[PDB]
Amino acid sequence: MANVDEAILKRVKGWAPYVDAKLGFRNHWYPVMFSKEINEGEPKTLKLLGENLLVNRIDGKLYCLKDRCLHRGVQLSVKVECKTKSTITCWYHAWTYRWEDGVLCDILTNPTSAQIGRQKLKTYPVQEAKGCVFIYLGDGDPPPLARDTPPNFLDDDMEILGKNQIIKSNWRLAVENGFDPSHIYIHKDSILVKDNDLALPLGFAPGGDRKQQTRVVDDDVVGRKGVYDLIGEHGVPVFEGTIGGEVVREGAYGEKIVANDISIWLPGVLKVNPFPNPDMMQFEWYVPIDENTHYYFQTLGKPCANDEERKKYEQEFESKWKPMALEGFNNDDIWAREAMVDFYADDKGWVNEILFESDEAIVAWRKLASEHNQGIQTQAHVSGLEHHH
């Protein structure tokens, strides 16, 4: 709420909330790291939706506390002091908080303080699923994690392996690039296309009405909100690029058909199926860290019926899929996202962009995101909500 020039928001009537959501959507679950990255009694720091957080694993269970002391606002992490298994003590004046509920249970520098038991450090729900750590960056009782995950990600037999890193672009540029039907063009020379004999057109010549270009899901059995890209249902794949009638480029005429099932879901996770192989699936989140950066949380899923296949899958992942697909293919997406930063940096790109037919998919996402997000993260949420009268 109130992150962009009001004159710009007034112009973008189709999706003002989305344009305002510079810092992301509050009250949604977000993956931030892999379970193996956080060990028992070893607190880890991270920034999510502009908020500095601390996550710890106690007796195997994860806990999340805002990494900002209530007293003078210092990050507790500057000098971690976990003096008892269930608490953390600020290094400055020793205010002590419980990981379980964030309650200020003790103050070593003044055991008689009236503040003890009268203040609470912000805590956020944390849940581990498929070896991934999700944090509910929101207030009140969280909804099922399924609401904020693409279909099949939580399937019992789905084996998830992935990678995570920080990318220098606002999260929305990442989301739009991923769901962009015509961005395939930047992948025409990827090693994966050749080395995995994939069929990859340069783009699509749309067919049918614009209503048929996408399929919006307003509610799943779990409250999921998303959009399916259906440009290929009535569209003509373009395999030969021409300029002035002359052929100047060709798509890839491989045998493997992939990525014919693409959908984007709130709070901002893409599902591409099948990819990068006919028997696999890719789920990737674009998690807001701050207004200029995001976590590019990539995961590849494959059904596995036993430890054998899982072991085999993990072997193929490390030896082929990770370097050839997650990196060899998706690396081009990273610099493409970075290339849009300047145009949207002053928020003017949201008004000056000139869209074409395939952008119906992006428009559908902006509208869906604007109508069904669970809250706009504001700078005030970061510093401290404010209200007068």
Binding site: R11, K13, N352, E353, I354, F356
Partner: protein, 105 residues
């Protein structure tokens, strides 16, 4: 040469009406007072449908970015629009509104 849109009655002054055409791009009919006008429905600046925009006098504002055009001349009225809109001839013979199949030259 002409297409039957609707009865001048169905349209309140200051309203827009989208006219779909088989085999062709949609058109937009505007009623400014008691006179009618028609242009392409698709905004020249992108893929927005002007029929979903807001009409203020003889100026239609696009719902996507706030660009605008004069529905009479089709000339851009507000940024970011820069490409003039295709205008079509409208006729109200006997309370019935008609729109030309092609843009007026």
């Amino acid at each position: 040469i002409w297409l039957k849109v609707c009865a001048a009655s169905d349209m309140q002054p200051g309203t827009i009406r989208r006219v779909n055409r088989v085999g062709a791009a949609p058109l937009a009919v505007y009623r400014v007072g008691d006179q009618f006008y028609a242009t392409e429905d698709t905004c020249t600046h992108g893929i927005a449908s002007l029929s979903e925009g807001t009409l203020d006098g003889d100026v239609i504002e696009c719902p996507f970015h706030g660009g605008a055009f004069n529905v009479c001349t089709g000339m851009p009225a507000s940024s970011p629009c820069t490409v003039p809109l295709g205008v079509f001839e409208v006729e109200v013979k006997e309370g019935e509104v008609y729109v030309a199949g092609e843009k007026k030259l």
